[PDB]
Amino acid sequence: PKAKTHSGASKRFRRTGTGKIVRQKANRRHLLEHKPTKRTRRLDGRTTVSAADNSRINKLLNG
Template sequence: MAKYKIKTHSGAKRRFDISGRGKILRRKIGVNNFRRKKRGETLREIPGKRPVAPADARRLRRLLPYS
């Protein structure tokens, strides 16, 4: 009997990246809305990626099966 392929969650593949070592990375919050209220210094500190929490990483592995 043939094995079935698991579909990748399309929302998760847009929002998360996989590092070279296999960690799941997320964007930091607070960049998209209400930018005018924030200081430039604050906005420059925000960009970048952070690893997700271990409990969330386990859940995301099911959504991103081939990464």
């Protein structure tokens, strides 16, 4: 049979044009009462995945 995909890795990982892998960043949802805005501001956007986990993430996304 086919190779089934990983839900989480599909919902928390996408791919751009040139094959990069992309994620979002952490400590953004709650407890913002005391987090300064610069700390709240480098956590926005997306970020390219590390090197070390690229392979693992390929194997999760594809099959």
